[PDB]
């Protein structure tokens, strides 16, 4: 009560985006280094890196992806139905997302 | 000749389109998504083109109510469709015979698994 | 106007309901005012007083301070 | 040489794609799927569409 | 307190079709408004006492009225009570 | 006086139809409009 | 008084338990194929008589 | 029809059809030392055409994935506002549509020249696929026999004195 | 979500706000009093505007197209028709809650009539009538025998109400060809003008 | 046109037209306003052509 | 040595057993690979028994659960044995998966040992 | 201090003296819900345990061989894991406990 | 609302409407007035100037 104005809400939105931008900087540097990772010369030292494409099957990845998309969709449904639903009726969605 | 059907623009492309009366005659006896969308579109077009303010403000209130009701209908649609999609995804991968016969050369690096430069990695000559 | 027909309680306070229309009560005791309808919101005042004072800043959870 | 031909065809294509495809495609913006005539749905900027259409 | 118990209609008027209480064996959600809590009853006659059931239903159903559907051409004039000004 | 498939099918239908009321009640919109 | 009602309200009929519903279903009479027990001569065949026996026990 | 039927990366309906997955798997079981300089040229042209094609396939499948993701959300178009759900469903569905596209054989003149050539390169490629990729060769042999190709390496070979190396699927003689 | 526009804010003192929060009866009383005040204030503003318009006349005519004029009238009639349909649908949906005394008898009548019409018979509907609307008519028989919202008569009355509202008086409009870049009057043929 | 009129009352042709109509109106899409202004802000954005015809815009000098 | 691809046949039970008994007992296999298969066999055996036993205990508890204990005998038996079936299947599947993953690692080690994979060399 | 409201009074802790708490007529009774409650609750707990402690414990401490989902997306060579050559300063213990 | 004829005559005689109403409420019809929601804003002393 009496503290959460529009300025405070905008401040917390900015704080969220700033934290996730900070955490995405070091990860971005590591990803860039991962892309052009160092290796031995292809001529005599490392003749096999031509065939080391490191390609992972997309079918296995797709079956891996199910819980994350599930929680995303459940969270959207939880936030949309908050307009006309109570707390005890939404505990089902909250508990499902928790599990 | 050619200008009659190449340069003479059609009437419909110029004037404003009229209401399609076919789509408001036989309506289902339901407050479904189709009927709610029709009401919302009617009131939005009216307030977009009407010089009368009393009817416009009445339609604004009714449009807010219709927005809430259409949000509810869309929530139902989203729940049903996405739950069906997730269950179908899970069932497909439950019945699908996953190909586990892919090449495993990527995991094997014989020069690194057994270091070919053994006893020479440390400086010795 | 569907007026509130009767309040069967023996509390003479609850007789206020009979004066108003069902739609009027529905607007100000439900829908937008659902978390306020027919409730004495003393807890809102108590929690506001809890928030705005210079209290102990060690909070464990919403209900309690840190031991 | 090829370039020249291409551009000629490109220009020709525009002509042939004028009345045959794009104008009939624009016939689909007269009314919405609900039958109500087209009206403006603003994304962020509430532009004033004061002129006729 | 029975005075605080009400069978409130849905906020979304199009969602009355999609209620459990539409079924003959569904659920009836009665809101206690002094605490904003919910009482979910099974609307089967075998779970209820006939000697007090009608009284409870009459006392709890007061805000689910005909105005929830709207006002027709005749009831719109009676939707409110006129305010007379200057009659002294 | 024994197992019967009609009774089994009726029981299966009752089992499937039992959780319908609770799911519908969970999906129900309340009389709350959290603007 | 409460124990005499088995800790349930005397005025509420209540819902039958799983055992009571199961016993109510299991004691229902079996009305077999009634079209087999007809004075039609077509039911006098050996196959029709065998089906009638094995169904209307 | 088209003015570029001469193009090696082009093809008609009745050309040999190989999906991108089949093409890459076939490439995984060949050696360049065993191919003549003409066969290497065919494979290099196919490589450039196929790198562009594998780059472009998700673009082809994007409209269908977009439509399916929209239909999964509901009948409401919340442009710029339903982007999160739309693109989560997209990151799920677009891989499925690309799966259907990449497992779909597509005809090409280079495909029909690499496999069905009557010189030593064609025989080498056919036998290499026959031995190292039995399933790919099963499908490919069915397709080639259906297209009035008569090679010894086909499972459906009625003139052979040796039994087939795989199950011969039913077909009209 | 949508932003509601039907909120009227009234300032209160902290003591009065505390009493409003902890006393629902006082809250309802003050709210109804303020609603009456809002009605009075709106009526006063409307009367002031009427006097001003009488004294000084209209600001000017409205440049509109005849197509847009006709479409506005059609949209109003369609909105009224859909409101009537939604009213009937809501009355049928909320039947078990609006009137719980007669619900059993009315439901029995509706169900027996529906079973009669759809058992050993084929029900052939003509026009806009449907099975759901026929069940609605069966349930609310006694109510519809008093004021039937007959679709044809209600549509005629809707058109009369729309045209008698006074918003669509042709003297208020300067009909034009809206598409033309230069403002030009309505150039439809004389017979088309007479038909309009 | 004569042929098309002649085959208007046929049940098979009417069934095909009915399927076409049903598929046409099957997908009705709602386009909401997702800005915080919502309905009232959009409504006020569409008032330009009618502002000058309002009493508060009439020339009315105080003195 | 095995064919690779989407269209290829997955390892059947007979093929897995034959390869396991090849890696365990045959010569031409270094001591490390055979020891890997032996350690696969030793550690995996716990999980089948553990799953079966845990399922038995859970099913014994479930046969007397508050709603299960008041069901007719057929429904009560099915609902009671469901946890046992689930846990028994979990144990068997986990044992098979662990054993076969370690055995396939040993098979890869053998193939690299004898240079029987193209596009793999030191 | 917060209960010392300056303009209104907080409700009394005890119920109003006018109220009478003597038992009356029973209105509604669905007792079997309790059993169902028990069932579901217990089921969840049991399932929770099996899905949160028994399976992780058995596949983390009772074996060294990984399962397929531990390394299917990785391109390391196959290897086993031990509970003792990792996390020397035990930060996993408070995390698991919490 | 109904305004008495005598009261209206008194208002018209005493006060002559010379200026228009700038409040947009003047456009509201009685249907839209009845749909308004009366919210309350506690107005106390102000100590925070940001
Ligand atoms: C400390 C340690 C303690 C340890 C304690 C435990 C130790 C062990 C105890 C004993 C363990 C079990 C022993 C064997 C029991 C075998 C079942 C049995 O007795 O069946 C009698 C049963 C006698 O029939 P009934 O129960 O009188 O009549 C059944 C009803 O007609 C129709 O039935 P309904 O209407 O009630 O519905 C049944 C239906 C209902 O299904 C559902 O509700 C689905 C969800 C639950 C499953 O379920 C099924 O049909 C089950 C699926 C298989 C058939 O006979 C058979 O089942 C014969 C075989 C039929 C095959 C079909
Ligand atoms: C804990 C967390 C909460 C509970 C979660 C469990 C499921 C929900 C509860 C339930 O089914 O209770 C039935 C149970 C029985 O209801 P009833 O009507 O009183 O039963 C007496 C019958 O009238 C008369 O009894 P009867 O003899 O006629 O037969 C009824 C009884 C007979 O049962 C028996 O005789 C055997 C009893 C034990 C059966 C256990 C089976 C599963 C065992 C699992 C073990 C591991 C766990 O069958 C059942 O009670 C059904 C058991 C569950 C079935 C599971 C499979 C459902 C498949 C999907 C159905 C819907 C879609 C298909 C529709 C097809 C076309 C219509 O009711 C309750 O437990 C009442 C309280 C419910 C509390 C939870 C409410 C919130 C959760 C809602 C659902 C989940 C969220 C949905 C989405 C929400 C966001 C949009
Ligand atoms: C002879 C041995 C069986 C009867 C011993 C009692 C004395 C006697 O003749 O009683 C007549 C007895 C009626 O007298 P009852 O004393 O009131 O019956 C006592 C029953 O417990 C009354 O209980 P229930 O009738 O419920 O028990 C039988 C019931 C439940 O009981 C069981 O399922 C027991 C299963 C035991 C299996 C034992 C190991 C094998 O069986 C079934 O529901 C399964 C289907 C049975 C009929 C299937 C075949 C119908 C005729 C097909 C003709 C096809 C013609 C064209 C094709 C070409 C020719 C093949 O008639 C029947 O039970 C008719 C069905 C007989 C089925 C026997 C088991 C299947 C054999 C293969 C198919 C034939
Ligand atoms: C966690 C559960 C803690 C115990 C609990 O809450 O018991 C409530 C339960 C009383 O709840 P209620 O619904 O008011 O009374 C049940 C009726 O008497 C009617 O009794 P009932 O037929 O519902 O039986 C009591 C019910 C519930 O009792 C239990 O679940 C207790 C199981 C042993 C816990 C240690 O089921 C069992 O006792 C069967 C347990 C089978 C193994 C699991 O406590 C007991 O029945 C005694 C528990 C003694 C534990 C030592
Ligand atoms: C933080 C993000 C980091 C960056 C991540 C980037 C990931 C890469 C995404 C873009 C490139 C995708 C190239 C796919 C090329 C496939 C070639 C081929 O032959 O595939 C056959 C393969 C065959 O199956 P396979 O995948 O099992 O491969 C066979 C096995 N190996 C690996 C040994 C060859 O795949 C398929 O047939 C099915 C999957 C098709 C490809 C799907 C691509 C989706 C691309 C968009 C994803 C994101 C959408 C976001 C929308 C918003
Ligand atoms: C910045 C980006 C890079 C960060 C690198 C951080 C340092 C490396 C690192 O991650 O070390 C981890 C360190 C341990 O590193 P370490 O020292 O053991 O590393 C291994 C070192 N060698 C191989 C040489 C022996 O901490 C942990 O692993 C703590 C784990 C806590 C979380 C455990 C969760 C358990 C509960 C959930 C599962 C059960 C549910 C039921």
Strands I62-64 and I173-175, bridge-based pairing: parallel
The pair of three-digit structure tokens given for residue H79, joined into one six-digit string:
């442009």
Alpha carbons H156 and H141: distance in angstroms, whole number: 7
Q: Which residues of C touch E78 (CB under 8 A)?
A: 1
**Which residue of F1, F2, F3, F17 sits with most ligand 1 atoms within 8 Å of its CB, as the best mutation to test the pocket?**
F3
The pair of three-digit structure tokens given for residue F10, joined into one six-digit string:
């009726």
Alpha carbons C27 and C31: distance in angstroms, whole number: 6
Q: Cα I161 to the chain's mean position, in Å?
A: 11
Look-up of token digits 């036993």: K53
Degrees, nearest 5: CA angle I81-I83-I87: 120
Q: Is the CB of H105 under 6 A from ligand 5?
A: no
Q: Say how many C-beta atoms besides its own lie within 10 A of residue B39's C-beta.
A: 28
Closest to E30 measured CA to CA, from E40, E20, E22: E40
Q: Do chains B and E touch (3 or more CB pairs under 8 A)?
A: yes
For residues I89 and B31, is the Cβ–Cβ distance under 8 A?
Answer: yes
Which CA distances in Å does K60 have to A76, K52, K74? 41, 12, 15
Closest to I174 measured CA to CA, from I188, I161, I158, I186: I186
C56-65, Cβ contacts within 8 angstroms, sequence gap of 24 or more: none
- Cβ contacts below 8 Å, chain B against chain M, sum to 16
Alpha carbons K112 and K114: distance in angstroms, whole number: 5
Q: Which residues of D touch H80 (CB under 8 A)?
A: 43-44
Which CA distances in Å does H149 have to B74, H11, H18, H117, H162? 55, 17, 16, 11, 19
Q: K66 C-alpha to center of ligand 4: Å?
A: 8
For residues I83 and E66, is the Cβ–Cβ distance under 8 A?
Answer: no
CA dihedral in degrees (L57, L60, L61, L67; nearest 10)?
120
Residue bearing the CA closest to ligand 3, atom 63: G54
Contacts of residue B15, defined as CB under 8 A and 6 or more positions apart, other chains included, come to: I65, I67, I178, I179
H or E, element range at I159: helix I151-164
A-facing residues of B in 86-105 (CB < 8 A) are 86, 89-90, 93, 96, 98-99, 102, 105
Contacts of residue K16, defined as CB under 8 A and 6 or more positions apart, other chains included, come to: K100, K103
Contacts of residue A85, defined as CB under 8 A and 6 or more positions apart, other chains included, come to: F29, F30, F32
Backbone angles phi, psi at E42, to 5 degrees: -85, 125
Q: Say how many C-beta atoms besides its own lie within 10 A of residue A85's C-beta.
A: 21
Dihedral sign for Cα H68, H74, H80, H86, please.
Answer: negative
- Note whether G41 contacts L: Cβ–Cβ < 8 A: no
Which CA distances in Å does A70 have to A93, B85, H81, J21? 11, 10, 19, 36
- Note whether A46 contacts B: Cβ–Cβ < 8 A: yes
Closest to E13 measured CA to CA, from I19, B39, M23, I75: B39
H or E, element range at K50: helix K31-62
Nearest chain B residue to J54 by CA distance is: B51
Burial class (CB in 10 A: 0-12, 13-18, 19+), H48: exposed
First to last CA, chain D: 44
Which CA distances in Å does B109 have to A55, K43, K102? 15, 27, 18
Residue bearing the CA closest to ligand 6, atom 31: L92
Q: L53 C-alpha to center of ligand 6: Å?
A: 20
Q: In 3-state terms, what secondary structure has residue B99?
A: coil
For residues I58 and I172, is the Cβ–Cβ distance under 8 A?
Answer: yes
Q: Cα B115 to the chain's mean position, in Å?
A: 54
Which CA distances in Å does I116 have to A69, I113, I120, I133, I141? 50, 5, 8, 16, 17
Alpha carbons B59 and I72: distance in angstroms, whole number: 13
Contacts of residue L19, defined as CB under 8 A and 6 or more positions apart, other chains included, come to: none
Looking at the CA of residue L42, tell me the nearest atom of ligand 4. 1
Alpha carbons B98 and A60: distance in angstroms, whole number: 8
Contacts of residue G40, defined as CB under 8 A and 6 or more positions apart, other chains included, come to: none
Degrees, nearest 5: CA angle I121-I124-I130: 115
Contacts of residue A30, defined as CB under 8 A and 6 or more positions apart, other chains included, come to: none
Contact state of B16 with D35 under an 8 Å Cβ cutoff: no
Closest to K99 measured CA to CA, from K32, K48, K61: K48
For residues K105 and K36, is the Cβ–Cβ distance under 8 A?
Answer: yes
Looking at the CA of residue F2, tell me the nearest atom of ligand 3. 26
Burial class (CB in 10 A: 0-12, 13-18, 19+), L35: middle
Looking at the CA of residue L96, tell me the nearest atom of ligand 6. 36
Closest to I96 measured CA to CA, from I86, I107, I82, I84: I107
H45-53, Cβ contacts within 8 angstroms, sequence gap of 24 or more: H45/H8, H45/H9, H45/H110, H46/H8, H46/H9, H46/H108, H46/H110, H46/H111, H46/H114, H49/H8, H49/H9, H49/H108, H49/H110, H50/H20, H50/H23, H53/H20
Look-up of token digits 């669509």: I168
Q: L50 C-alpha to center of ligand 2: Å?
A: 21
Backbone angles phi, psi at D42, to 5 degrees: -85, 140
Which CA distances in Å does L35 have to G7, G17, H33, K59, L30? 15, 12, 76, 18, 10
Nearest chain F residue to B75 by CA distance is: F27
For chain D, helix, strand, coil in percent to 5 are 50, 5, 45
G-facing residues of K in 1-60 (CB < 8 A) are none
For residues H80 and D43, is the Cβ–Cβ distance under 8 A?
Answer: yes
Nearest-10 crossing angle of helices A87-98, A66-80:
170
Look-up of token digits 């793999």: K120
Alpha carbons H152 and I3: distance in angstroms, whole number: 75
Contacts of residue I83, defined as CB under 8 A and 6 or more positions apart, other chains included, come to: B39, E70
Q: In 3-state terms, what secondary structure has residue H34?
A: helix
Closest to B113 measured CA to CA, from K105, A43, K28, K25: K105
Alpha carbons C38 and C14: distance in angstroms, whole number: 10
The pair of three-digit structure tokens given for residue A2, joined into one six-digit string:
């009496």
For residues C39 and E33, is the Cβ–Cβ distance under 8 A?
Answer: yes
Q: Cα H21 to the chain's mean position, in Å?
A: 6
Q: In 3-state terms, what secondary structure has residue M40?
A: strand
In angstroms, the separation between the Cα of residue A38 and the nearest Cα of chain L is 17
Q: In 3-state terms, what secondary structure has residue H146?
A: helix
Alpha carbons H103 and B110: distance in angstroms, whole number: 33
The pair of three-digit structure tokens given for residue H90, joined into one six-digit string:
């997209």
The total number of residues shown for chain J amounts to: 63
Q: H95 C-alpha to center of ligand 5: Å?
A: 7
First to last CA, chain E: 43
Residue bearing the CA closest to ligand 6, atom 40: L52
Task: Convert I78-113 to b/e letters by CB count within 10 Å (16 or more is b).
Answer: bbbbbbbbbbbbbbbbbbbbbbeeeeeebbeebeeb
The pair of three-digit structure tokens given for residue I1, joined into one six-digit string:
């979500």
Name the E strands within chain G.
none
**Residue to substitute from J26, J28, J29, J33, interface H, most H β-carbons within 10 A:** J29
Residue bearing the CA closest to ligand 2, atom 2: L40
């Amino acid at each position: 009560y009496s503290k959460f104005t529009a300025a405070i809400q905008r401040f917390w939105k900015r704080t969220y985006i700033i934290f996730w931008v900070i955490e995405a900087g070091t990860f971005s540097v590591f990803f860039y280094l991962t892309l052009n990772a160092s290796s031995e010369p292809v001529y005599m030292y490392d003749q096999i890196k031509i065939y080391k494409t490191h390609l992972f099957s997309w079918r296995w990845f797709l079956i891996k992806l199910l819980p994350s998309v599930s929680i995303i969709l459940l969270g959207y449904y939880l936030q949309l139905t908050l307009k006309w639903n109570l707390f005890n009726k939404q505990n089902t969605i909250v508990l499902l997302i928790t599990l | 000749m050619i200008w009659k059907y190449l340069q003479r623009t059609n009437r419909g492309n110029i004037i404003q389109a009229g209401l399609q009366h076919r789509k408001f005659e036989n309506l289902p006896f339901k407050q479904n998504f189709d009927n709610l969308t029709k009401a919302y579109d009617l009131r939005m077009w009216y307030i977009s083109n009407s010089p009368h303010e009393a009817k416009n403000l009445e339609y604004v209130n009714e449009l807010e109510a219709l927005h809430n009701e259409l949000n509810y209908q869309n929530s139902r649609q989203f729940l049903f469709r996405t739950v069906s999609f997730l269950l179908g995804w899970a069932l497909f991968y439950q019945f699908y015979e996953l190909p586990k016969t892919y090449d495993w050369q990527d995991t094997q690096e014989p020069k690194h698994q057994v270091p070919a430069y053994g006893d020479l990695e440390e400086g010795g000559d | 106007m569907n007026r509130f027909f009767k309040v069967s309680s023996k509390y003479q306070y609850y007789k206020y309901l009979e004066q108003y229309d069902a739609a009027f009560l529905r607007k100000y005791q439900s829908e937008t005012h659902w978390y306020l309808g027919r409730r004495g919101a003393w807890k809102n005042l108590v929690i506001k007083y809890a928030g705005d004072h210079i209290s102990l800043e060690e909070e464990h959870n919403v209900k309690y301070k840190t031991h | 040489n090829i370039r020249a031909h291409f551009w000629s065809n490109f220009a020709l294509g525009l002509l042939i794609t004028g009345p045959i495809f794009i104008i009939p495609f624009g016939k689909a913006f007269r009314n919405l799927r609900s039958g109500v005539p087209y009206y403006f749905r603003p994304k962020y900027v509430f532009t004033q569409k004061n002129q006729y259409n | 307190e029975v005075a605080h118990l009400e069978h409130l209609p849905p906020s979304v008027r199009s969602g009355v079709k999609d209620l459990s209480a539409q079924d003959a064996d569904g659920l009836v959600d009665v809101t206690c408004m002094s605490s904003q809590r919910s009482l979910v009853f099974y609307k089967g006659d075998q779970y209820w006492n006939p000697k007090v059931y009608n009284d409870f239903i009459n006392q709890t159903s007061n805000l689910w009225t005909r105005n929830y559907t709207g006002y027709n051409r005749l009831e719109v004039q009676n939707s409110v009570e006129q305010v007379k000004i200057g009659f002294s | 006086k024994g197992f019967n498939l009609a009774n089994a099918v009726n029981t299966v239908k009752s089992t499937l139809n039992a959780p319908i009321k609770h799911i519908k009640r969970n999906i129900e919109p309340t009389g709350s409009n959290y603007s | 008084a409460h124990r005499s009602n088995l800790y349930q309200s005397k005025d509420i009929v209540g819902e039958k338990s799983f055992h009571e519903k199961h016993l109510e279903q299991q004691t229902a009479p079996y009305s077999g194929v009634k079209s087999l027990e007809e004075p039609v001569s077509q039911n006098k065949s050996f196959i029709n008589s065998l089906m009638r026996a094995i169904h209307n026990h | 029809m088209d003015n570029n039927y001469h193009f090696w990366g082009n093809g008609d309906r009745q050309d040999v059809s190989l999906s991108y997955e089949d093409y890459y798997s076939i490439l995984d079981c060949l050696l360049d030392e065993k191919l003549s300089p003409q066969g290497l040229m065919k494979f290099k042209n196919l490589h450039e055409v196929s790198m562009y094609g594998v780059s472009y396939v998700p673009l082809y499948c994007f409209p269908v994935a977009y439509g399916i993701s929209h239909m999964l959300t509901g009948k409401v178009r919340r442009g710029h506002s339903g982007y999160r759900n739309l693109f989560s469903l997209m990151s799920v569905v677009l891989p499925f549509t690309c799966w259907y596209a990449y497992t779909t054989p597509i005809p090409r003149r280079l495909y029909t020249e690499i496999i069905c050539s009557n010189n030593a390169d064609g025989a080498y490629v056919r036998n290499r696929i026959k031995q190292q990729k039995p399933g790919i060769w099963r499908k490919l042999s069915q397709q080639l026999y259906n297209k009035n190709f008569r090679f010894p390496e086909l499972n459906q070979d009625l003139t052979a004195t040796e039994f087939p190396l795989d199950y011969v699927a039913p077909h009209k003689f | 979500f949508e932003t509601p526009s039907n909120m009227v804010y009234s300032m209160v003192n902290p003591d009065e706000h505390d009493r409003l929060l902890v006393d629902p009866a006082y809250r309802m009383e003050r709210t109804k009093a303020l609603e009456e005040k809002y009605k009075v204030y709106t009526s006063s503003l409307r009367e002031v505007e009427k006097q001003f318009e009488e004294r000084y006349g209209r600001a000017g005519q409205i440049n509109i197209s005849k197509v847009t004029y006709s479409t506005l009238i059609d949209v109003e009639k369609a909105v009224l028709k859909m409101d009537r349909l939604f009213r009937k649908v809501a009355k049928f949906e909320n039947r078990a809650f609006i009137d719980r005394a007669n619900h059993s008898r009315r439901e029995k009548r509706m169900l027996e009539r529906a079973q009669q019409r759809w058992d050993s018979n084929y029900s052939f509907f003509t026009g806009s009538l449907t099975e759901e609307e026929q069940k609605y008519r069966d349930y609310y028989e006694t109510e519809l025998e008093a004021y039937p919202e007959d679709e044809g008569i209600e549509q005629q009355l809707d058109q009369q109400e729309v045209l008698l509202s006074g918003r669509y008086d042709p003297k208020l409009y300067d009909f034009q060809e809206g598409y033309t870049k230069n403002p030009e009057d309505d150039q439809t043929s004389l017979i088309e003008k007479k038909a309009f | 046109l004569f042929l098309i009129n002649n085959y208007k009352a046929y049940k098979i042709n009417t069934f095909f037209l009915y399927i076409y109509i049903y598929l046409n109106n099957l997908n009705i899409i709602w386009y909401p306003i997702f800005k915080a202004y919502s309905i009232f802000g959009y409504y006020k954005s569409t008032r330009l052509n009618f502002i000058d015809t309002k009493n508060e815009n009439i020339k009315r000098i105080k003195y | 040595m095995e064919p690779f691809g989407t269209d290829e046949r997955n390892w059947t039970h007979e093929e897995k057993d034959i390869i396991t008994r090849f890696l365990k007992y045959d010569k031409h296999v270094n001591l490390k690979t055979a020891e890997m298969v032996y350690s696969a066999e030793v550690e995996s055996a716990y999980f089948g028994k553990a799953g079966a036993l845990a399922g038995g205990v859970i099913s014994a508890l479930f046969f007397n659960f508050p709603i299960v204990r008041n069901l007719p005998i057929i429904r009560r038996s099915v609902i009671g044995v469901l946890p046992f079936l689930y846990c028994y299947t979990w144990g068997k599947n986990t044992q098979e998966e662990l054993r076969w993953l370690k055995t396939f690692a040993a098979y890869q080690r053998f193939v690299v040992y004898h240079g029987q994979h193209c596009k793999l060399w030191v | 201090n917060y209960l010392d409201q300056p303009f209104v009074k907080v409700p009394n802790a005890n119920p109003n003296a006018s109220l009478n708490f003597e038992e009356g007529e029973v209105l509604y009774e669905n007792t079997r819900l309790l059993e169902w409650a028990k069932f579901w609750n217990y089921s969840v707990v049991v399932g929770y345990l099996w899905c949160a402690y028994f399976v992780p414990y058995n596949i983390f401490f009772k074996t060294h061989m990984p399962l397929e989902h531990a390394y299917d997306n990785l391109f390391f060579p196959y290897f086993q894991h031990t509970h003792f050559l990792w996390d020397n300063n035990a930060l996993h213990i408070p995390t698991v406990g919490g | 609302t109904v305004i008495n004829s005598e009261f209206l005559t008194y208002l018209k005689s005493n006060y002559k409407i010379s200026f228009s109403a700038s409040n947009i409420v003047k456009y509201l019809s009685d249907k839209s007035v009845n749909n308004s929601v009366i919210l309350y804003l506690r107005k106390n002393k102000i100590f925070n100037k940001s």
